[PDB]
A paper describes a structure:
Here we introduce RFpeptides, a denoising diffusion-based pipeline for designing macrocyclic binders against protein targets of interest. We tested 20 or fewer designed macrocycles against each of four diverse proteins and obtained binders with medium to high affinity against all targets. X-ray structures for macrocycle-bound myeloid cell leukemia 1, γ-aminobutyric acid type A receptor-associated protein and RbtA complexes match closely with the computational models, with a Cα root-mean-square deviation < 1.5 Å to the design models. Among the four targets tested here, binders for MCL1 and MDM2 have helical motifs, binders for GABARAP have a β-sheet topology and binders for RbtA sample looplike conformations that make extensive contacts with the flat surface of this target.
For designing macrocyclic binders against the human GABARAP, we used a similar pipeline for MCL1 and MDM2 but we doubled the number of generated designs and defined six hotspot residues (Lys46, Lys48, Tyr49, Leu50, Phe60 and Leu63) to guide the macrocycle backbone generation to a specific site on the target. GAB_D8 and GAB_D23 demonstrated a half-maximal inhibitory concentration (IC50) of 0.7 nM and 2.5 nM in the AlphaScreen assay, respectively. GAB_D23 crystallized readily with GABARAP and also closely matched the design model with a Cα r.m.s.d. of 1.7 Å when aligned by the target and Cα r.m.s.d. of 0.74 Å across the macrocycle alone. The X-ray crystal structure confirmed the key designed interactions, such as Trp5 and Ile8, with the main difference between the design model and the X-ray structure being the switch from a type I β-turn from Leu1 to Gly4 in the design model to a less regular conformation in the crystal structure, with a tendency for a type I′ β-turn from Glu2 to Trp5.
Numbering used by the authors:
A (entry chain B): 1 to 13
B (entry chain A): -1 to 117
The structure:
């Protein structure tokens, strides 16, 4: 996702 | 013997807090978690430290997801520490965030192969 964050369940940046 | 997070040294507080403000408003059902290996751990550092975690996940679910990112063998034990204590398993990550978030609005969790953080 935004700002280098990783959505932990899906791995989406 | 006490938590140490390289992330806080790398990013000065005012920058962290501004980002925490923004990320809490953008992703309000998620908690922003900074995950680092405890010093002295024989595990290996994550490629990325910054995780957005749905507030309804249990601590135990979070344990497993981090384990899969380390590519950690199932036989290698893994313990987590927040503000020098192992968190409760029954808590949700939202509940853990409520109790333990810092003043930059992030939650800081360390992991180790040892049940004692400084070992
Ligand atoms: Cl860092
Ligand atoms: Cl969200």
């Amino acid at each position: 996702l935004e700002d280098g964050w990783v959505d932990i369940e899906t791995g989406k940046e | 013997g006490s938590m140490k997070f390289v992330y806080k040294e790398e990013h000065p507080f005012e920058k962290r807090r501004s980002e925490g403000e923004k990320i809490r408003k953008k992703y309000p059902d998620r908690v922003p978690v900074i995950v680092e290996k405890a010093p002295k751990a024989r595990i290996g550092d994550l490629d990325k430290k910054k995780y957005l975690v749905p507030s309804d996940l249990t601590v135990g679910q979070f344990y497993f997801l981090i384990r899969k990112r380390i590519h950690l063998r199932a036989e290698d034990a893994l313990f987590f520490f927040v503000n020098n204590v192992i968190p409760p398993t029954s808590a949700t990550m939202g509940q853990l965030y409520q109790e333990h978030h810092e003043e930059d609005f992030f939650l800081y969790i360390a992991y180790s192969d040892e049940s004692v953080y400084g070992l």
